Enzyme design. Structure first.
Site, PDB file in Angstrom:
ATOM      1  N   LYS A 135       1.210  -1.436   6.816  1.00 13.96           N
ATOM      2  CA  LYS A 135       0.330  -2.540   6.445  1.00 13.96           C
ATOM      3  C   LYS A 135      -1.086  -2.208   6.857  1.00 13.96           C
ATOM      4  O   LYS A 135      -1.268  -1.648   7.924  1.00 13.96           O
ATOM      5  CB  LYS A 135       0.725  -3.822   7.122  1.00 13.96           C
ATOM      6  CG  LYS A 135       1.920  -4.456   6.445  1.00 13.96           C
ATOM      7  CD  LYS A 135       2.544  -5.569   7.256  1.00 13.96           C
ATOM      8  CE  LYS A 135       3.834  -6.085   6.638  1.00 13.96           C
ATOM      9  NZ  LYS A 135       4.292  -7.360   7.227  1.00 13.96           N
ATOM     10  N   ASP A 163      -0.343  -1.397   2.157  1.00 13.76           N
ATOM     11  CA  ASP A 163      -0.506  -2.728   1.617  1.00 13.76           C
ATOM     12  C   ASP A 163      -1.589  -3.499   2.300  1.00 13.76           C
ATOM     13  O   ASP A 163      -1.430  -3.830   3.480  1.00 13.76           O
ATOM     14  CB  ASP A 163       0.814  -3.530   1.617  1.00 13.76           C
ATOM     15  CG  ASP A 163       0.754  -4.804   0.758  1.00 13.76           C
ATOM     16  OD1 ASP A 163      -0.281  -5.325   0.335  1.00 13.76           O
ATOM     17  OD2 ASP A 163       1.938  -5.355   0.604  1.00 13.76           O
ATOM     18  N   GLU A 192      -1.361  -1.087  -2.117  1.00 11.63           N
ATOM     19  CA  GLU A 192      -1.282  -2.380  -2.756  1.00 11.63           C
ATOM     20  C   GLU A 192      -2.476  -3.257  -2.531  1.00 11.63           C
ATOM     21  O   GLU A 192      -2.832  -3.567  -1.409  1.00 11.63           O
ATOM     22  CB  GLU A 192      -0.039  -3.246  -2.334  1.00 11.63           C
ATOM     23  CG  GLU A 192       1.260  -2.434  -2.406  1.00 11.63           C
ATOM     24  CD  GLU A 192       2.473  -3.208  -1.975  1.00 11.63           C
ATOM     25  OE1 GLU A 192       3.471  -2.670  -1.546  1.00 11.63           O
ATOM     26  OE2 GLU A 192       2.370  -4.502  -2.120  1.00 11.63           O
ATOM     27  N   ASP A 215       0.778  -6.234  -6.885  1.00 11.58           N
ATOM     28  CA  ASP A 215       1.896  -6.980  -6.292  1.00 11.58           C
ATOM     29  C   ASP A 215       1.738  -8.460  -6.631  1.00 11.58           C
ATOM     30  O   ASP A 215       2.176  -8.922  -7.688  1.00 11.58           O
ATOM     31  CB  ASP A 215       2.007  -6.670  -4.749  1.00 11.58           C
ATOM     32  CG  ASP A 215       3.190  -7.314  -4.046  1.00 11.58           C
ATOM     33  OD1 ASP A 215       3.366  -7.319  -2.870  1.00 11.58           O
ATOM     34  OD2 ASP A 215       3.956  -7.995  -4.819  1.00 11.58           O
ATOM     35  N   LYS A 237       8.905  -8.279  -7.371  1.00 12.97           N
ATOM     36  CA  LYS A 237       9.735  -9.072  -6.481  1.00 12.97           C
ATOM     37  C   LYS A 237      10.590 -10.048  -7.314  1.00 12.97           C
ATOM     38  O   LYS A 237      10.169 -11.163  -7.648  1.00 12.97           O
ATOM     39  CB  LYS A 237       8.835  -9.844  -5.521  1.00 12.97           C
ATOM     40  CG  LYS A 237       8.125  -8.909  -4.516  1.00 12.97           C
ATOM     41  CD  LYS A 237       7.270  -9.760  -3.571  1.00 12.97           C
ATOM     42  CE  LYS A 237       6.826  -9.034  -2.313  1.00 12.97           C
ATOM     43  NZ  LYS A 237       6.062  -7.842  -2.665  1.00 12.97           N
TER      44      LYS A 237
HETATM   45  O1  LIG Z   1       7.217  -4.786  -0.552  1.00 11.44           O
HETATM   46  C1  LIG Z   1       7.933  -4.413   0.391  1.00 11.44           C
HETATM   47  O2  LIG Z   1       7.875  -3.245   0.790  1.00 11.44           O
HETATM   48  C2  LIG Z   1       8.681  -5.392   1.307  1.00 11.44           C
HETATM   49  C3  LIG Z   1       8.260  -6.853   1.199  1.00 11.44           C
HETATM   50  C4  LIG Z   1       6.736  -7.043   1.174  1.00 11.44           C
HETATM   51  O3  LIG Z   1       5.882  -6.147   1.216  1.00 11.44           O
HETATM   52  C5  LIG Z   1       6.588  -8.474   1.120  1.00 11.44           C
HETATM   53  C6  LIG Z   1       7.763  -9.225   1.096  1.00 11.44           C
HETATM   54  C7  LIG Z   1       7.690 -10.614   1.061  1.00 11.44           C
HETATM   55  C8  LIG Z   1       6.438 -11.227   1.055  1.00 11.44           C
HETATM   56  C9  LIG Z   1       5.264 -10.465   1.075  1.00 11.44           C
HETATM   57  C10 LIG Z   1       5.326  -9.071   1.110  1.00 11.44           C
HETATM   58  C11 LIG Z   1       4.125  -8.238   1.128  1.00 11.44           C
HETATM   59  O4  LIG Z   1       3.779  -7.724   0.048  1.00 11.44           O
HETATM   60  O5  LIG Z   1       3.334  -8.309   2.086  1.00 11.44           O
HETATM   61 MG   LIG Z   2       2.708  -6.294  -1.192  1.00  8.77          MG
END
Ligand SMILES: O=C(O)CCC(=O)c1ccccc1C(=O)O
Ligand SMILES: [Mg+2]
Length: 322
Positions: A135, A163, A192, A215, A237
């Site tokens: 992250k 991300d 991301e 995303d 998702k």
């Molecule tokens: O995307 C993945 O690797 C796991 C899940 C993930 O990143 C996520 C999962 C649920 C809610 C928000 C996020 C996110 O994008 O931060």
């Molecule tokens: Mg994400």
């Protein structure tokens, strides 16, 4: 030989480990539902809208779910449109017709954090394809860029997924990027949602040479799958998207555009997670999915994620709505 239809709906709450946060907010428990459809044959699905992400609530999904089941019991009907419900129901139907494939691999790109040096040691020890998720955007941009660079420099065959959750301004994205050696940039598999706005994220990608992914954007109204310079992937998702069929369409759209599609967790229980893993193995065979979220939860339920040692709650222990 029975073609007799029956069904059950389960309601549940799984305690999360302490300290879980979602979009700067704490998450104490994971509330959700399962559906089990029988025709002679049996299929299951998970309906767990995610607070702060899903438009619908647990309660609303429950209502929609129960109504849909009431209809299905009499014969075939249209899918629900409410996304979490559509997902769970469509998976249950697919299991019934044996059209959701079984899979060898139950895998996830590990979500990494903590001390950079300790992380290096861990990554160094990964077998096969080294892909990991980090992250960004919580610390300042300089720190993030230096740490990513450290990781990339340490392990030549490491591929990182990052991300930012739309954290940055164009300046901050630049400040991040400056610290990443251009020779390593290609090993950022994707970043991301770097910036606050999609336009700025697109500028970042084109200007820095760092691949980005969408995303959240996929769920915004008017989103369109399109080839854009520097956009290398999309994060799908299912629980926030809708039916298995809509999911498949999205993967197909991405592939058609030469994009990587990653199947990603919405913090489903073990049941829904295993289904995501199967969706991934089937639809995105060469892309490890983003499913490293089981370890945030105190228990598994009904279906086990292979290799997990978390305790399992059996169906008999769940609250039945039907
Ligand atoms: O995307 C993945 O690797 C796991 C899940 C993930 O990143 C996520 C999962 C649920 C809610 C928000 C996020 C996110 O994008 O931060
Ligand atoms: Mg994400």
């Amino acid at each position: 030989g029975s073609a007799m239809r029956s069904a059950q709906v389960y309601r549940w709450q799984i305690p999360m480990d302490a300290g879980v946060v979602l979009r700067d907010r704490r998450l104490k428990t994971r509330d959700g539902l399962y559906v089990c459809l029988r025709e002679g044959r049996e299929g299951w699905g998970e309906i767990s809208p995610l607070p702060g992400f899903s438009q619908e609530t647990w309660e609303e999904a429950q209502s929609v779910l129960l109504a849909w089941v009431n209809n299905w019991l009499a014969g075939d009907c249209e899918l629900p449109q409410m996304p979490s419900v559509a997902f769970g129901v469509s998976c249950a139907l697919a299991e019934l017709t044996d059209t959701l494939p079984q899979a060898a691999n139950y895998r996830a790109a590990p979500l990494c954090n903590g001390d950079p040096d300790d992380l290096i040691l861990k990554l160094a020890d990964m077998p096969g394809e080294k892909v990991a998720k980090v992250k960004v955007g919580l610390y300042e941009a300089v720190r993030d860029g230096m740490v990513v660079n450290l990781l990339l420099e340490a392990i030549p065959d490491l591929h990182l997924r990052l991300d930012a959750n739309r954290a940055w301004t164009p300046l901050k994205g630049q400040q991040f990027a400056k610290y990443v050696n251009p020779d390593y940039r290609d090993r950022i598999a994707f970043l991301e949602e770097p910036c606050k706005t999609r336009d700025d994220s697109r500028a970042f990608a084109r200007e820095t040479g760092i691949a980005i992914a969408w995303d959240e954007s996929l769920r915004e109204p008017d989103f369109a799958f399109v080839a854009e310079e520097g956009v290398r992937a999309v994060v799908i998702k299912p629980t926030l998207t809708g039916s298995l069929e809509k999911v498949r369409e999205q993967v197909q759209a991405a592939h058609a555009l030469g994009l990587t599609a990653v199947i990603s967790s919405s913090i489903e229980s073990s049941l829904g997670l295993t289904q995501l893993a199967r969706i991934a193995a089937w639809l995105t065979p060469d892309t490890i999915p983003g499913l490293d979220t089981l370890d945030l939860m105190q228990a598994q339920q009904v279906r086990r994620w292979p290799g997990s040692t978390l305790p399992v709650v059996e169906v008999d222990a769940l609250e039945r709505l039907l």
